[PDB]
Design an enzyme around this catalytic site. Sequence first.
Site, mmCIF file in Angstrom:
data_model
loop_
_atom_site.group_PDB
_atom_site.id
_atom_site.type_symbol
_atom_site.label_atom_id
_atom_site.label_comp_id
_atom_site.label_asym_id
_atom_site.label_seq_id
_atom_site.Cartn_x
_atom_site.Cartn_y
_atom_site.Cartn_z
ATOM 1 N N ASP A 2 47.142 40.943 37.402
ATOM 2 C CA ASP A 2 47.140 42.179 38.338
ATOM 3 C C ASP A 2 46.735 42.026 39.710
ATOM 4 O O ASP A 2 45.476 41.879 40.031
ATOM 5 C CB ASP A 2 45.957 43.385 37.486
ATOM 6 C CG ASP A 2 46.208 44.628 38.020
ATOM 7 O OD1 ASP A 2 46.868 44.880 39.124
ATOM 8 O OD2 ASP A 2 45.296 45.232 37.700
ATOM 9 N N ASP A 48 51.941 44.829 43.802
ATOM 10 C CA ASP A 48 50.978 45.110 42.844
ATOM 11 C C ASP A 48 51.786 44.785 41.559
ATOM 12 O O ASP A 48 52.571 45.525 40.912
ATOM 13 C CB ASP A 48 50.468 46.505 42.646
ATOM 14 C CG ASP A 48 49.635 47.077 41.449
ATOM 15 O OD1 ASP A 48 49.037 45.953 40.956
ATOM 16 O OD2 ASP A 48 49.295 48.161 41.289
HETATM 17 C C1 LIG Z 1 37.278 49.211 40.750
HETATM 18 O O1 LIG Z 1 37.698 49.757 39.471
HETATM 19 C C2 LIG Z 1 38.724 49.457 38.190
HETATM 20 C C3 LIG Z 1 38.835 49.854 36.904
HETATM 21 C C4 LIG Z 1 40.066 49.531 36.217
HETATM 22 C C5 LIG Z 1 41.158 48.738 36.755
HETATM 23 C C6 LIG Z 1 42.452 48.199 35.890
HETATM 24 N N1 LIG Z 1 42.178 47.866 34.551
HETATM 25 S S1 LIG Z 1 43.523 47.380 33.675
HETATM 26 C C7 LIG Z 1 44.570 47.707 34.919
HETATM 27 C C8 LIG Z 1 46.120 47.505 34.779
HETATM 28 C C9 LIG Z 1 43.784 48.343 36.192
HETATM 29 C C10 LIG Z 1 45.001 48.736 37.229
HETATM 30 O O2 LIG Z 1 44.347 50.147 37.610
HETATM 31 N N2 LIG Z 1 45.697 47.798 37.947
HETATM 32 C C11 LIG Z 1 46.360 48.355 38.878
HETATM 33 N N3 LIG Z 1 47.429 47.636 39.796
HETATM 34 N N4 LIG Z 1 46.141 49.790 39.499
HETATM 35 C C12 LIG Z 1 46.701 50.455 40.554
HETATM 36 C C13 LIG Z 1 46.085 50.723 41.820
HETATM 37 C C14 LIG Z 1 45.771 50.117 43.176
HETATM 38 C C15 LIG Z 1 44.859 50.403 44.245
HETATM 39 C C16 LIG Z 1 44.632 49.741 45.507
HETATM 40 C C17 LIG Z 1 43.643 51.850 43.920
HETATM 41 N N5 LIG Z 1 43.004 52.351 45.066
HETATM 42 C C18 LIG Z 1 41.508 51.697 45.131
HETATM 43 C C19 LIG Z 1 40.444 52.160 45.905
HETATM 44 O O3 LIG Z 1 40.986 50.948 44.057
HETATM 45 C C20 LIG Z 1 44.161 52.551 42.636
HETATM 46 CL CL1 LIG Z 1 43.575 54.014 42.279
HETATM 47 C C21 LIG Z 1 45.170 52.096 41.625
HETATM 48 C C22 LIG Z 1 41.013 48.257 38.068
HETATM 49 C C23 LIG Z 1 39.750 48.816 39.039
#
Ligand SMILES: COc1ccc(-c2nsc(C)c2C(=O)NC(=N)NCc2cc(C)c(NC(C)=O)c(Cl)c2)cc1
Length: 387
Positions: free
Chosen positions: A230, A34
Site C-alpha cells: 500500500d 496509491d
Molecule cells: C493513519 O491511519 C491509517 C489507518 C488505516 C490505513 C489503511 N489500512 S488498510 C488500507 C487499504 C488502508 C488505506 O486507507 N490505504 C490507502 N491507499 N488509502 C487511501 C488514502 C490516502 C491518503 C494520502 C489519505 N489522506 C491522509 C491524511 O492520510 C486518505 Cl484518508 C486515504 C491507513 C492509515
Amino acid sequence: FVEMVDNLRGKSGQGYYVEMTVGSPPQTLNILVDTGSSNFAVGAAPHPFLHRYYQRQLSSTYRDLRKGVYVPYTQGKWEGELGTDLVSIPHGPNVTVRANIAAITESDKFFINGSNWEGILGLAYAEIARPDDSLEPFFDSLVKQTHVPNLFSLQLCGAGFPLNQSEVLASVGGSMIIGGIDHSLYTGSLWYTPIRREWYYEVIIVRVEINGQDLKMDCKEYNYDKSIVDSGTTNLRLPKKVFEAAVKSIKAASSTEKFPDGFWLGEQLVCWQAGTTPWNIFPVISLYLMGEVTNQSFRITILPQQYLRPVEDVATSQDDCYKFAISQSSTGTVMGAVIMEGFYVVFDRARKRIGFAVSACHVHDEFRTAAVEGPFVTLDMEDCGYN
Ligand SMILES: COc1ccc(-c2nsc(C)c2C(=O)NC(=N)NCc2cc(C)c(NC(C)=O)c(Cl)c2)cc1
C-alpha cells in the site's frame, strides 16, 4: 524506459506523486500514486490545501456520469461526482486514454497540507473501487485501450533525512515504470510472491524475524485479516498481536537507550546529536513471503533506516530526529511507503505476482544493507492466509 525514470516526487509522510493531465485542453495535476485503492479521483473544487483543481466546465471532452460517490476511510474521507475524461501521463507511456474520474467536491482530512498533489491514482483492482466493481480503475482502462503491458513497478526513494518544502519540490522522489521493469532501479535478484486475490495487492507473510529471532507466532496472525502492499499509507501497519510482539522485541534489542513511551505510538520524535543516530542498536526486521515454487519462500529484510522516518525538529536544530514508523493496525498488515522505500516493487498484474528487489536508492549505513534473499523450505504456507 528512460523517459519514466525520475518521474516521481514526494516523501513517505505526504506520499509519492506523478504528474498527469486530464481534459481538453490538458489540465495538469499532481497525482498521488496509491496501490492501496482503486479510484482515480481529483480535487474538483477549491480547498485550503490545493493550489489547483479539476475544472470540468473547461474540458470539452468531459462526460458526466450523473452519479455520486462516497469514499470513507478510518483516517479520512471524500465524496464526489463521477464522470469520464481524456487522461495522459506526460512522463509515462506516450498515450491518451478515456478513463473514469471522480471529481472530488467535498473532503475531510483526505488531502495533505504541503504534499503538492491534488488527486489520487488508485492502482489496485476493481473489486475495491467505489461505488462498485463496475467502475473500471485507471490501469485496467490503460491496458484495454493501448498496448502497454499489464505491469507496473515502483521505486520510492526516501531521502534518509528531512527535506524542506523547496527541497521536496526540487528533489526526485523515485520512479514509476508503466509497462515494464527498469534494471538500473535495483540490485540483486527479483523474488516473486503471488497475489493471493486480486482486490488489494494481497500477499501472504509466512514468518517474521527480529534480529533473526523468530517471533514464533502462528503465521495466520501476520495476515489477519489481510496483508497488503500500500503506497498511499506512510507506515508499516501491523495487527494488534503482531504489533505488540514486534514493539516488545524492538524495545528489548534497543534497551541500552530509553525512549518516551509516546515514541512507540508514533506520536513524538526522538532526536540525537547531528550524525550520531545509533542505527546499530535497532534490530533488522525480516518478513518471509510465500514463494512461487511450492513449499518455497523468501525474505525481505528492513533496516531501522526504513522504520524510523526522518522528521525535521520543532527546534529546527542541528539534531537528527525520527518518528517510529510502525503502527498498530485493525485492518491487517499494511506494507506502507516506509517499507516500499527499501525495495523495487514489481506489480506483475499479468502474472498475478509481486516482485521484490533491493532498491538502488534505499537508505542504509556502512555495516548493514536491506536484503531480498531465498529460497527457504517452508510448509503449509497456504494456511497462513486468513479466511
Ligand atoms: C493513519 O491511519 C491509517 C489507518 C488505516 C490505513 C489503511 N489500512 S488498510 C488500507 C487499504 C488502508 C488505506 O486507507 N490505504 C490507502 N491507499 N488509502 C487511501 C488514502 C490516502 C491518503 C494520502 C489519505 N489522506 C491522509 C491524511 O492520510 C486518505 Cl484518508 C486515504 C491507513 C492509515
